[PDB]
Design a protein around this motif. Sequence first.
Motif, short mmCIF file in Angstrom:
data_model
loop_
_atom_site.label_atom_id
_atom_site.label_comp_id
_atom_site.label_asym_id
_atom_site.label_seq_id
_atom_site.Cartn_x
_atom_site.Cartn_y
_atom_site.Cartn_z
N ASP B 27 63.36 -18.59 -6.63
CA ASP B 27 61.99 -19.13 -6.60
C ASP B 27 61.11 -18.35 -5.60
O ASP B 27 60.21 -18.94 -4.99
N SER B 28 61.26 -17.01 -5.56
CA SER B 28 60.51 -16.22 -4.56
C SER B 28 59.07 -16.05 -4.99
O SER B 28 58.23 -15.72 -4.15
N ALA B 29 58.73 -16.24 -6.29
CA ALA B 29 57.29 -16.26 -6.64
C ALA B 29 56.61 -17.50 -6.07
O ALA B 29 55.41 -17.46 -5.89
N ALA B 30 57.35 -18.59 -5.76
CA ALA B 30 56.69 -19.68 -5.03
C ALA B 30 56.67 -19.36 -3.52
O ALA B 30 55.61 -19.54 -2.90
N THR B 31 57.80 -18.97 -2.94
CA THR B 31 57.69 -18.40 -1.59
C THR B 31 58.96 -17.61 -1.33
O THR B 31 60.04 -17.88 -1.94
N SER B 32 58.86 -16.58 -0.48
CA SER B 32 60.05 -15.75 -0.20
C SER B 32 60.78 -16.26 1.06
O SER B 32 60.20 -16.96 1.91
N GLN B 33 62.03 -15.79 1.17
CA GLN B 33 62.85 -16.07 2.34
C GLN B 33 62.63 -14.95 3.36
O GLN B 33 62.06 -13.88 3.03
N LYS B 34 63.01 -15.21 4.65
CA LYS B 34 62.71 -14.26 5.70
C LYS B 34 63.97 -13.69 6.33
O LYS B 34 64.98 -14.41 6.54
N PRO B 35 63.93 -12.38 6.69
CA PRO B 35 65.06 -11.72 7.35
C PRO B 35 65.01 -12.04 8.83
O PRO B 35 63.95 -12.45 9.36
N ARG B 36 66.16 -11.91 9.50
CA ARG B 36 66.25 -12.07 10.95
C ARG B 36 65.14 -11.30 11.65
O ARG B 36 64.63 -11.80 12.65
N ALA B 37 64.84 -10.07 11.21
CA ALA B 37 63.84 -9.29 11.96
C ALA B 37 62.48 -10.04 12.09
O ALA B 37 61.79 -9.86 13.11
N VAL B 38 62.09 -10.78 11.05
CA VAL B 38 60.82 -11.51 11.14
C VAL B 38 60.98 -12.76 12.01
O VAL B 38 60.12 -13.06 12.82
N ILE B 39 62.07 -13.54 11.78
CA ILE B 39 62.19 -14.78 12.56
C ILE B 39 62.34 -14.44 14.06
O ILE B 39 61.70 -15.10 14.93
N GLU B 40 63.10 -13.37 14.37
CA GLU B 40 63.28 -13.03 15.77
C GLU B 40 61.97 -12.44 16.35
O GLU B 40 61.81 -12.47 17.60
N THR B 41 61.09 -11.88 15.48
CA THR B 41 59.78 -11.43 16.01
C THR B 41 58.98 -12.66 16.50
O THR B 41 58.36 -12.62 17.58
N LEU B 42 58.97 -13.74 15.70
CA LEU B 42 58.26 -14.95 16.16
C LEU B 42 58.91 -15.47 17.43
O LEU B 42 58.23 -15.88 18.37
N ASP B 43 60.29 -15.50 17.46
CA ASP B 43 60.93 -16.01 18.69
C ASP B 43 60.55 -15.18 19.91
O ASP B 43 60.24 -15.74 20.97
N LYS B 44 60.57 -13.85 19.76
CA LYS B 44 60.25 -13.02 20.90
C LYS B 44 58.80 -13.22 21.34
O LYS B 44 58.52 -13.29 22.56
N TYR B 45 57.90 -13.43 20.37
CA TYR B 45 56.52 -13.73 20.79
C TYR B 45 56.44 -15.01 21.62
O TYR B 45 55.83 -15.00 22.70
N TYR B 46 57.00 -16.13 21.07
CA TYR B 46 56.80 -17.36 21.83
C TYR B 46 57.65 -17.36 23.10
O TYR B 46 57.29 -18.08 24.05
N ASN B 47 58.78 -16.63 23.12
CA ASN B 47 59.66 -16.68 24.32
C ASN B 47 59.14 -15.72 25.37
O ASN B 47 59.53 -15.89 26.55
N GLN B 48 58.31 -14.72 25.03
CA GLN B 48 58.06 -13.65 26.00
C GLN B 48 56.58 -13.34 26.24
O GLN B 48 56.22 -12.90 27.32
#
Lengths: 413, 413
Positions: B27-48
């Motif tokens: 069901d990626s035409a409804a929304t795609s899944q995310k790789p670690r590189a993207v989720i860890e980018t958000l974590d590094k932003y809010y953590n740092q």
Amino acid sequence: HMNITDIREQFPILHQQVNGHDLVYLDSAATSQKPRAVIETLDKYYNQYNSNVHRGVHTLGTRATDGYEGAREKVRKFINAKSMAEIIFTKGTTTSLNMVALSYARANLKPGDEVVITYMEHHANIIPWQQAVKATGATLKYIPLQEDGTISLEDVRETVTSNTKIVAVSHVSNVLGTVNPIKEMAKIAHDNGAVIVVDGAQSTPHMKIDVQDLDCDFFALSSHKMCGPTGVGVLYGKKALLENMEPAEFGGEMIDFVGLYESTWKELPWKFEAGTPIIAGAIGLGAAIDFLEEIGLDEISRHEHKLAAYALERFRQLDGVTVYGPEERAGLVTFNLDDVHPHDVATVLDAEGIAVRAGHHAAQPLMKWLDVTATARASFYLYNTEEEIDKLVEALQKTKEYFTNVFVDLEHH
Amino acid sequence: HMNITDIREQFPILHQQVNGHDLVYLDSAATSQKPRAVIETLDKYYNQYNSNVHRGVHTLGTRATDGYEGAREKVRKFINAKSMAEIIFTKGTTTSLNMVALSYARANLKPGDEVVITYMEHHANIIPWQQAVKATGATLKYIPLQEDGTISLEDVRETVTSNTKIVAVSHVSNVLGTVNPIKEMAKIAHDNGAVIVVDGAQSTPHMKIDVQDLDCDFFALSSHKMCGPTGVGVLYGKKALLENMEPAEFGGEMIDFVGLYESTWKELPWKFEAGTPIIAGAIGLGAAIDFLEEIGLDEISRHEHKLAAYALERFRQLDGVTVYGPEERAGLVTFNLDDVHPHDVATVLDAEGIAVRAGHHAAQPLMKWLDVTATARASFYLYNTEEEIDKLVEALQKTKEYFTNVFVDLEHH
Ligand SMILES: Cc1ncc(COP(=O)(O)O)c(CNc2co[nH]c2=O)c1O
Ligand SMILES: Cc1ncc(COP(=O)(O)O)c(CNc2co[nH]c2=O)c1O
């Protein structure tokens, strides 16, 4: 009471140095920091149950939908709205106020009607009204301020007339720290036949909000100032007004039937949410509200009262420093050093690890009212301490001494 | 070539079961899944380094600003725009198309002018134009489709006239899989004096985009379909058109000077970004683009060509199944089983771990064109495999057999 050591342990970002000194972050009125509970909520969403919402078709889709609409109910309870139909998710306070100006003001103003605002407003609660009055041939008017930067209810009564259709005002000023008497101003607006639109961006993170006590017609807030993710906000509006306003954006998700030339809308609140929504950010804002509620908004307000009374006293110990606004205030101090530009103050403080903001704080008419071109601002939240206020006032004292020294040295050449 | 095992290892969400069966997410035409590189980018932003942007005042503020504007340059390069002034961050494709309809269409349409769209459009690229034509007294017209759900350039030339001011069309259909001939349609629009607005929500995640080859005047896309965070999108517009369009929202950050009654705007792109922006989500979309570029958009397109040719062949092995749209297509198949409602198909498949979507896919005029009330859709992305297509077609076969069995059993009562 809240234990500030235990609260600070929950915010990873506070535990680092900048320019070789422990960070002292005093810029939460520009944006707040986030606790592990919120960041790990986003991680758990993307690692476990991301999918698009409002299908009711597949298991992860149902989980994501239950998370998103669950967060809507958390917001409803958090501001004591009567219904989820009155809680619209937006990109932030600025978009929420724009929605009111486009869908309510542009549809309900005519020549002779007035929109009344105040000199202390942030631009997000000025420019949309400037544009709506220009579009409609209505008039914009400003409630004046008292000399300490508060609003008197007699000036409100004078400025608001039976031609006023909208009064728009901040709950708390992000520059003066003033807490405005919104419940009394809503009475005055309603007595004159107007609605009141309240900019809650700086009140909601820091004090309990009860929209049924305030009786505001619309209330806008931003997640990023209240420990939640960026990119999300809320517009609350009384259900009878939202029912009669047309959408501000159009697309999928907010329709019921689409023909070639005509469409009909979904019921509230989805009428006002076009497109795939801000799914993770809204679930993270739900986590921020659970976090703040577990601490208690009244506990956080009491802590910030302590910090602001401490700061105002310690600032009065400094020679050559001006603080703007009233003694009774929210948790921020905007100031200037007599002979040092506020940008240079902010630069020197950042070299001592301390983060504050300098500039106009998106309130140019207020800076003009204050007779200044720019100011510096230290703003507080639940993770700040009086030791950090000591660091700030010690750095301001050394800043004063430093600039006077370079002045004196340069005096010979 | 891309190794699909190594790519799937990067997406934590794929590694779980639903109803006791390994998840098969189609069901990626409804929304795609995310790789670690993207989720860890958000974590590094809010953590740092979270802070508000465009102060230039304190160290974390500078880090956040450099991350946000760095992500703007990544988007520019990713779609081969000439300038960052042409890249506006929005909440998603739907808001980007609404901005064009409000700021460009409502300002440039008059009675007698036409907006031309197509029967296959998603609602986000229908309803804003319905409203803009209603507001202006212009006319909306539809390019017809060929019987396989493609568009012929002769029908485009017939429908677009010298009264056409705007042609708006999807790059790839989220229902038919059709890839539309946008570069040729942009020639036709421009030959008639119109601009072309391209809905790129389903093309950008899955094939290289080069806006200087397409020559589109506006192009809109959504982060959540291209491995990036929810709540963010982009509007690209040629700089000469954005320079002449007024803002769609007003507030802080997008102003230069604010007087009591009048304001002036910042230069592009900030003119169109009112309020604190979507800071973490835009930095995460920059990470998604770095992730997809390291794999290669042409590699992902080649993988999806493989998966779609495999699926169409395997669907032709099934009796009693109709597939809509052309043979040459993007990576999705929308279909129905002859005697089973698509919602019931999606429910049964979710019991076998398989996630697909059923309904109108926000394309009601297209469903009417297809003579159906709803359809089921399996859509693919870089983490899907032919083994998952085997699971899907085996489950459709068992679905057919199951519903025929209950039919036969009920036949006596
Ligand atoms: C009172 C008030 N109104 C509106 C806004 C706009 O909210 P946004 O859409 O989330 O940006 C802010 C944020 N004001 C500030 C943002 O950075 N320093 C500030 O003082 C504000 O504090
Ligand atoms: C071609 C196309 N246009 C516009 C949109 C709207 O993008 P949004 O603002 O990010 O929602 C979508 C998303 N379409 C779908 C979203 O869920 N199933 C879909 O087919 C789309 O695929």
